[PDB]
Amino acid sequence: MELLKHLSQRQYIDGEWVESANKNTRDIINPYNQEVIFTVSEGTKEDAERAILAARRAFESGEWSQETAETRGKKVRAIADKIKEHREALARLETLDTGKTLEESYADMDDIHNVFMYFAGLADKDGGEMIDSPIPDTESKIVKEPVGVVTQITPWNYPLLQASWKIAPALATGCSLVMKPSEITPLTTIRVFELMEEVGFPKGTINLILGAGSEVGDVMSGHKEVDLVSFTGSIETGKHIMKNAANNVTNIALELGGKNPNIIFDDADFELAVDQALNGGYFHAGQVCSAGSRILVQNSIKDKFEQALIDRVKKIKLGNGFDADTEMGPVISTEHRNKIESYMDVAKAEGATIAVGGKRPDRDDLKDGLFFEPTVITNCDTSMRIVQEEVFGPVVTVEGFETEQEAIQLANDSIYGLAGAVFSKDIGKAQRVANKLKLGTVWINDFHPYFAQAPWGGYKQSGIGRELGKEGLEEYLVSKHILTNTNPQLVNWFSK
Amino acid sequence: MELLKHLSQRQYIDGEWVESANKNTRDIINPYNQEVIFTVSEGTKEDAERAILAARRAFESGEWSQETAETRGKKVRAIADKIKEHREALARLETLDTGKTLEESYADMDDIHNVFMYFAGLADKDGGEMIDSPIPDTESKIVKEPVGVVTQITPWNYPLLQASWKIAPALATGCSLVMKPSEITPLTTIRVFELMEEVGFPKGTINLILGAGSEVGDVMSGHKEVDLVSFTGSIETGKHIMKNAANNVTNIALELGGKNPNIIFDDADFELAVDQALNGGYFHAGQVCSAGSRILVQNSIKDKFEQALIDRVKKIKLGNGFDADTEMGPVISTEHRNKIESYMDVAKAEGATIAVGGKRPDRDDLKDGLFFEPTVITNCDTSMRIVQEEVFGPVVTVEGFETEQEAIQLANDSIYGLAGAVFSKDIGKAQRVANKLKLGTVWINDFHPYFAQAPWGGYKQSGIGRELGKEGLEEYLVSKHILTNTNPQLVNWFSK
Amino acid sequence: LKHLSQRQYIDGEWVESANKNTRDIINPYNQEVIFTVSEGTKEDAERAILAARRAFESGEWSQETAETRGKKVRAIADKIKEHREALARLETLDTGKTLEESYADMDDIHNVFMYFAGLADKDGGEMIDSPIPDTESKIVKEPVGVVTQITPWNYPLLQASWKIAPALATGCSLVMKPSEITPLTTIRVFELMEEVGFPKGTINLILGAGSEVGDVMSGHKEVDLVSFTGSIETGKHIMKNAANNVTNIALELGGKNPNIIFDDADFELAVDQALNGGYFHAGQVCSAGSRILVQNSIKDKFEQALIDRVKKIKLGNGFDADTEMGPVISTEHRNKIESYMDVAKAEGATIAVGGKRPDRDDLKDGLFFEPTVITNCDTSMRIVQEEVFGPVVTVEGFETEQEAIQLANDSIYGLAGAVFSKDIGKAQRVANKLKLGTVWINDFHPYFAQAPWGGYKQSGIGRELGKEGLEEYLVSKHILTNTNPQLVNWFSK
Amino acid sequence: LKHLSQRQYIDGEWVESANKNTRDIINPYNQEVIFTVSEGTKEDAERAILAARRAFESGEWSQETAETRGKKVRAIADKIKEHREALARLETLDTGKTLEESYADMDDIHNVFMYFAGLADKDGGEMIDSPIPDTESKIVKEPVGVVTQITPWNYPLLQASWKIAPALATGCSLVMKPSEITPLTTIRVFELMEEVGFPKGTINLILGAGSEVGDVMSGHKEVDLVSFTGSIETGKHIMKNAANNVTNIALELGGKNPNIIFDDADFELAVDQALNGGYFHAGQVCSAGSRILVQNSIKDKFEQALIDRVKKIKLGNGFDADTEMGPVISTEHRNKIESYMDVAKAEGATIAVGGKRPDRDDLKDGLFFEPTVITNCDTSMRIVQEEVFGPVVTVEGFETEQEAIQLANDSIYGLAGAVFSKDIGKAQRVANKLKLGTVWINDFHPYFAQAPWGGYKQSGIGRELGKEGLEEYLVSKHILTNTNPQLVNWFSK
Ligand code: NA
Ligand code: NA
Ligand code: NA
Ligand code: NA
Ligand code: NA
Ligand code: NA
Ligand code: NA
Ligand code: NA
C-alpha cells in the first residue's frame, strides 16, 4: 500500500506513460481479502496496434538492434541490479497482487535478478558462425540477428518472473517488444517498466499494454508487423494465439500448462518423498505450470504414502501471504476458484474419492478471501478427467503403479509434457525413467527447480519452444546465411 | 520409361508396400507432352492415420530412436551412396516427372547425395550439454532426443531434393517419419523409399503416403500423435497446416515461397548481372522457391539492363528436358500454367508492360506440352499484384531504384523473406545491403546457391524454422533438462 | 607380407633410407624375423618435413573444401574395413596380441576415420558481435599447418589413426614415424592412403629410430605441431625440443590407472573387469588398470577370486582361437618387467601369483611373462607408483570413499580409471574427484572417437579424439575489418 | 603510493620476503625511485603454490557455483572502474606511457573482467551420444587446477587481467608474479581482489626477479598450467622447465608485426595508422607494427610523409596532456634499442630519422629514445627480422600482392598484422594467407575480450581472451557409465 501511492497506473507506449485511448480502467484486487488495491488503464486494440507500430519503427531505426551486444548486456545487467535494489518492495507488491507467501515472492525476486544477470552475460557471447563452404571461391557465414518485433503475453501466477523470462532475452538480442501482463495481476510488470525506463532504452524498444480489451490479444498475436509471439498461459488460449499467428506465418513460442507427474518408487527416501509431494502439490496453492498434481506411487508403499500425505495436508497453514506463519495463500480469483470447485464435482461423479480438502475453508479469517483447501484425490485412474486435465489449484491425485514400466506408461499418458520428478535412492533406475519420460524437465530426487542456465518448456501440448538458457535466447534470434562469391564467373546456361 | 517397368506403384506403410485402402489410383503425367507415364495408389485418410500410428509404435519400441547415433549415421550414409549409385536413373525419372532439364536433374542428384552425406556425418556429433548448476549439490544436463513422430509434406518442383532435406535429419536424429510427396510428382520419392528399404529400417520408422485424398493433409497436420509437421509448399496451404497443427500444439517447420529480390547496382559487373538475372528468373521455368522474380536495378543502368535482358530472353531455348540443347522445360501442370497466364492479364490491367514473352509458345514441338515463354514485365511498381505475389513461373518483373536506401526499402517491401541477391563490385556496399535485407539467405555477386552445410529458410511469411545445416537438424530434436539433486534434504515448508 | 612395401614414403614416392640401411621386424610370439624395412636417416626426416611444408603452402590439400577432405577421409575409413582381416593379422603378427583384440582395433580404426570424416566440414569458425562500432569481427579456423606424429608400439595402427584422421580432415600436412619395432600396419595404411589419393607431400612416412630422427621431427622450425604418444621420458625430451621453436605439443604418456572396487560392487563383474583391466594386451596399455584399490571388507575375498582366475589365463599364439593373452613386445621390455618383480619383493610386496616367464614348451621361444598379482603393497612403493606396462597388477585396500580417492589420486599420472559400485550416486561422487581424463563407472577400457581422451598431470598435454582432438589440428585467426576507418590523429600533423 | 602495500600476498596475508630483501621501483620519465617493495624468494613462491594447491583441493572456490564465481569476477570489474583514476596514474608512473593510454587500459580491463564474469556460467561440458549401447557418456569441464601467471612490464595490469579473469571465472587457484620492474598496479589489484573476498590461497602475489622465483613458478610439480607473457628467450626457458612435469603451457611472446600498405589504401589513413602502429607506448607493444611493407608505386611518397610526421612527434612526461610518446622502460632496454641502430647501419640500412636519444633539456633525465624510421632495408637483415620493441619501424617495398604476403610471413613470428587497401576483397585474400593470430583490415591495434588473441609460430602457444582464452583454464573429463554392465568373460573361469 506504501508503494502503490507512487506506482504508475498507465500503459507505456513509445516512450510515454499513457492512459487507454477510451479512458477505460480496471480495478485490481488482492485475493486475500478481495479488496480493490489499485486501478489501472484498460487499453484498446488501437493502443496495442500503436505499440506494435512503435516497436517496428524502433527496430527499423537500429538504435537498439544495432547497438553493440556488449552495451546491450550492460543495460540488461542494470535492470538486474534494479531488481535487487527494489527486492523488498517488489516482493511485497507481488504478494499483494497474487496472494502467495512473502517468502515465495522473495524467492521470485532472487530468481528474477539471476535471469536478467544470466542474459546480460550471454548477450555478447555469439554472433553466428563461419562455414567452410563446399563451393570454391566463396565465403559463407551465418549471422544471428534479433528476430525483430516480439509480442509477449504473461500469466497471473508468477507475473514478474514470467515477464523476466521474456524481457531479458528480447533486450539482450536487440529486439523491440510489446508486453501485456495478465489483466488481473499487472502491478509488478508496471513496476519493472518503470525500472527499465530508468535504465534507458530507445523510444519504442519496450512497450507495455494493459488489459484484456476487445481484440487486444488478437492484435498482439495476429499483427503483420510481429515476428514472434511468445505466450505463457492456458492451453485453450495458446491454441487460439497460434491459429492467429498463422495468419502471418509468425513464429510462436508457447508455454502452456502441464499434468506433471511425481513418481515415487518404493525405494525412495520416504520422508523426502512426502515432503516433496506436499511441495510439488501446494506451493502457490498449486497454481504452477509445473505443479506436481499427478502423484504416481508404487503399490507396495501406496497406503503408507497416502496416509502420510493426508495427515500432513490437514496441517497446512492457510492465511495472509504477509503473515510469516502462512504456508499457503488463496487462489487468484473468483473465476479460478469456481473452476477448481467444479472439478471436485467432476472428480466425484467419475468415481474418485476426495480424501481430504475439496472445499473452501470455514475459518473466520479466511472467509473474505479466495481460499480453497489443499486437497488429495484418491482412487482414481488415468481415464478420468480429474487425472488428465490441469486443475491448476491446490489439488493432487494419487495413482498406484506396480513396475517401473507401468510408472513410465502412466506418466506419459497425458496430452502434456512440461516437467516431472522421479524419487528413488536407486539413481540408475531414476536415470532410466528420466530418459523415457516425455517431459522438458525431469528432476531426480527433487521437485520444482528451474534456473536461467537451463532451458524450460514442454513436449506435446505443453508448448512449443523453450525459455531460459541458450535455447531461450535463440527464440529471439534469426539466422541469415550470407554467401559471397569471391570470384564470380558467368554461368552461360542461357545462350548468347 | 525403362525404369518405370520395375518401379513400385504403392504406398509404403509399416514395412509393407500397400495399395490405397479404397483401391483408388492416380495417373501421373509428363509435363513435356501431357502423356500419362505411370499410375499410383491414391491413399485415404485412414491410410495416413495407420502410417502415423505405425510411426508412433516404432518410435516407442526404440529400435531406431534408441539406436546409437553413430549407427544411424552409417545408415543415412548408405542412403547417400544409393543415391549416387542410381544417379542416372533418378535424374531421368525426375526430368520425366517434373519436366526440368536432365542437367538440372543431375545437379539435384549430386546435391541430394551431399545432403544425406552431411546429415550422416552430423548424426553423432552433439548429444546435449552439461550445465554448471547454480544450485549446490545438483547435477544439470541437457539431453537432446529425437522430437518424435514427424509428418513431412513436399512440393512438386524439386521432389527428391526437398524430400532429402526432411528425411536425412529425421533419420539421423532417430525420429519416425510419414512422408507425402506432391500428388502430381511422386516418382523419385517412391524410388527413394525402395532404396531406403534396401538399407533397412525398423518397421514403421519410415512410411510413404501417396495422394491428395480427402482429409489426408488434415490428418498429417492434425493428428495427436505427431510431434512435428514439416511442410514445404504454397503459403495458403502452409497457413492451413499451421492452424491444424495448433489443435495439438504441434511444432511446425514451414518453407513457403518468396518474392526474392535480385538487386543490381550500377557498379555491378554488368554482364555477370545479366547472366545471373536470367539464371535467377528462368532455371526450372522459374518454379523455384527462391527464384529471382523481382529484379531491382539502379535507375542509371535500368534502360541498358532491360534491353540486354530482353534480348537474351528472346534466345532462351525451350524444349524436352531430355534434349541436351534445351535450356528451359515446361511448367508443371495445366492448372499451374493457367495460373501463370491469369497473372499476365492482372499485370496489364494494373498498368505493367509485358516486354517479352507472356504467352504459350507456338512452335510445333512445344504445342503438346505445358510450355510458357520466358517473360519480362517492365514499367511496374511495388503496389502491383504482379510485383507482390509469387507467380512461380518463368516470369520476372523489373523495378528501378535510385539509392542504396531505396533498394533496401523496395526489397523488404513484400510479405516474404526467403532469399535474395546483391550485385555490386563494391563489396562493402553489398555487405551493408545484405545486413539490412530481411531474408534467410543473401548472395553477394551470385544467385541460387544452397548447400547442406548452411541453414535455409524464411523470415516473415516465407516460413517458420530452418532446413539444412545444424539448425535443420535441430528441428528434429527436443531438449530435456535432467536435474539430479545429489544430496536431497527435506524442505520442511509445510508443518509436521 | 609378400606384397607389403618395405620402404618409407616421402613426397609421393616409396623410397629407401638415404643410406640404404634396414631393420628386421620381429614377431614377439616366436622372436622370428618376419619382415625387413628401411631404417631412415635424419636427412630423410628433414626432407619429409620440407615436402610437407611445400605441400601445405601449395594449398592443394589445405585449401581443398572441407567437404571434399571429409570424403577422402571417409575413403580411408572404407579401405580399413575392406582390409580388416589382413590388417588385424598384420597387427597380431607384429605386436603379439590376440587376433580378437586386433579385430577390435580395426573396428575402432574404421570408426575413428569415419568420425573425423563426418566432422571435417562442420565448423569453420565464428562471427563475433564486435564491441567496436563499424567493425566486423570473425574467427576463422585454419589447419595448424605441418604436423609431426610419433606413435607407440602397443597399438600401432590405432594410435596412428587418432593422429592421421584429424590432421587430414582439417587440411594439415603430416609426417608420421611409427615405433621402430612395429611399423607393419602403418606401412600398410600408407599404401591405402596412397590409393585414395592425396597431393604430393601431404602425407609422409618415416621409418626407424635413426640417430636424431626423433629430434628432427620434434625440433624442426617448419613444424607447427608435434604429436607424440609414448613413454614419459621421451615425451619430456620431445617437449623440450619443441620449445626451441615454440612449437605446439600434444602428448599422451602413460598412466597409473586406478580400478576402484567398493564392497557394494557387483562382485563377479568387478573380478571379471579387474582381469580385463590388468591383462588385456598383457597389460601393455596406457590405460591398463594396474592399480587395484579394493574396499577392506571384501579385500580377502577379492584377492582369492582374482588369483584363482589369474592361474587359469591362457597364454599362447595370438592367432590361436583359445589364446587369452599373448607375449610382451620385446626382450628389453620383458627384462624391464622382470626387474620390477625384484624391486617389488625388495620393498616388501608379495608376488601372490605369476612374476616369471612361463615354462610350457610352446611358450619357451616367445616373449611371454605370466599374469601377475602383487599384494601387501602400499602407495609409497615403486611397484605401485611406477608404470610397469606389463601383465601385472597391484592390490591395495581402502577403508572409506575418501581414502579410495586419496590413494587413487596419489600418483604423478592422470589418464584413466574406474569405479565399481552398485551405488551409482557414490560412483559419480568419486568420479568427480578423480584427476583423470577418463573415468569409467562399472566398466573398464572403453574409448571412442566421439569423446576426448588424454591425461591430467604427467599423463599428457592436450586431447585426442572428439571435437577437442580435432582442435589440436586447427589454429584460430581473428580477422577484424574496420568498415568506416577514420584517422586517429594521436600524433601531431 | 603512501597507502599502497609494499608486500607480497600469500595465503591470505600480506607478507615480506622470507629474507626481508627489497627492490626499488623506478619511474622511467626521470629515473627516480618511486616505491620500494619486497623482493621474494624461491621458498616464498613455493609456499604460494602449495597454498594455491591446498585452496584448490578444499573446493571453496573450485566447487563454488559458476554463477557465484561470475558475480565475484564482476565485483572485481566494478572495483577497477571505481578506482580508474588512481590505477591509470599508477600505471603511467610505473611504465611511463601517456595517462590517456593508461585510461584506455583501465576501460579495457573493466571490460575484460566483465566479459569473463558473464562467461563463467555458460558451459560446463557436453553430453555425448555414445556408440556403445547401454552407456551414458559425458564430458565435464573442470578448472585446470593451480595456475602460475607471469606478466610483462609493458601493460602490467592489462596483461594481468587477461590471466586473472578466466582463472577466477573457472574456479582455479592462481599465483601471479608481475614484472620485477613494474609491480605497482598488480599490487593494487590484489588489494582490490582481497576486498571482494576470495577463499584463503585462491589468489597469491609473488614479487621479484624472474631469475630467482621463475624456475619454481614454471617447474613446480603442483602447477597444472603455466601462463607466461614476455620475451621469446624467457618463454622458451619456461616451456622447457614446464616439461619437467608435463605441465600445460600458454605463451604470448612478441612479434615482428607487418603493416601492409597497398597503393590503393586511403593514403592519409595509412600514414596515420603507420605512426600509431609504430609508436604507441614507444613501440613497446607485442603487436607493434614495426615492419611496414609498402607497395613500390607509393613508397617514396609514403616514406616522405611518414618521416615528416615522425619529426613532429611530441616526447615528454606521460602526465602532461601534450605528450604523444613517453620514454622506454629501463636503461637496459634503451641500451638494447641503441645497439640495434649500430646493427642496422652495419648491415647497410639507413636511419632516415631518429635513432638516438633526444637532446632537449626536459628529456635528459628520462629514458627517452627518438621515434625512428629505418629505410633501405631488406628481409635478410637483423633489423627487419628481430623484435626491437622500441620506437622504431622499418620500411620495405613490395611489387605484388603475392610478394607482400611472402615478405610478411618471412619471419619467425606470427602475432598480428594489418592490411590497408580500399579493395576489401584484396585485403581479405591477403588476410587469409598471413600466418598471424589477428589480422586487421584498414585498422591497427584493436583487441577485445570477445575475441581470442595469440600467435602462430614463435609468437606463442595457445590463446588469451575470448572463449578460447577461458578454455586454457579448463580441463576435460570423460565420465562413461555402463548402465547395464555384463561380464565380458574373456579370461577362463
Ligand atoms: Na491481483
Ligand atoms: Na508441442
Ligand atoms: Na509428373
Ligand atoms: Na515467419
Ligand atoms: Na614387431
Ligand atoms: Na599435463
Ligand atoms: Na617502474
Ligand atoms: Na607456436
Author numbering:
A (entry chain D), B (entry chain C): 1 to 496
C (entry chain B), D (entry chain A): 4 to 496
The authors write:
We studied a putative BADH from an early MRSA COL isolate, denoted SaBADH, and showed that it is a functional NAD+-dependent BADH that utilizes BA as the primary substrate. BADHs are a group of enzymes from the aldehyde dehydrogenase (ALDH) superfamily that primarily catalyze the oxidation of betaine aldehyde (BA) to betaine; some BADHs also utilize other substrates. BADHs resemble ALDH in structure and are composed of a Rossmann-fold NAD(P)-binding domain, a catalytic (substrate-binding) domain and an oligomerization (bridging) domain. The solution data are supported by the structural analysis and emphasize the importance of the NAD+-driven structural rearrangements at the cofactor-binding and substrate-binding sites for enzymatic activity.
Among the previously functionally characterized SaBADH mutants, the Gly234Ser (G234S) mutant, G234S-SaBADH, had a higher affinity for NAD+ and decreased substrate inhibition, suggesting the existence of a structural and functional interaction between the NAD-binding and substrate-binding sites. Thus, this mutant was of particular interest and its structure determination in the apo and holo forms provides key atomic details on how the G234S substitution affects NAD+ binding. To fully understand the kinetic and inhibition mechanisms of G234S-SaBADH, we determined its crystal structures in apo and holo forms and in the presence/absence of BME and compared them with the wild-type structures. The first peptide stretch adopts a helical conformation extending helix αF in the presence of NAD+ and interacts with the adenine ring of the cofactor. Although this segment is unwound in apo SaBADHBME(+/−), it forms a similar helix turn in apo G234S-SaBADHBME(+/−) and apo SaBADHBME(+)PEG. NAD+ binding results in displacement of the Cα atoms of the second area by ∼1.6–1.9 Å. However, in apo G234S-SaBADHBME(−) and apo SaBADHBME(+)PEG Val288–Ser290 is also repositioned in an NAD-dependent manner. Firstly, the adenine ring of NAD+ imposes structural changes on helix αF that were also observed in apo G234S-SaBADHBME(+/−) and apo SaBADHBME(+)PEG. Difference electron-density peaks around the Ala212–Glu215 segment of the helix of these apo structures suggest that this region might be flexible in general and that NAD+ binding selects or induces the favorable conformational state.
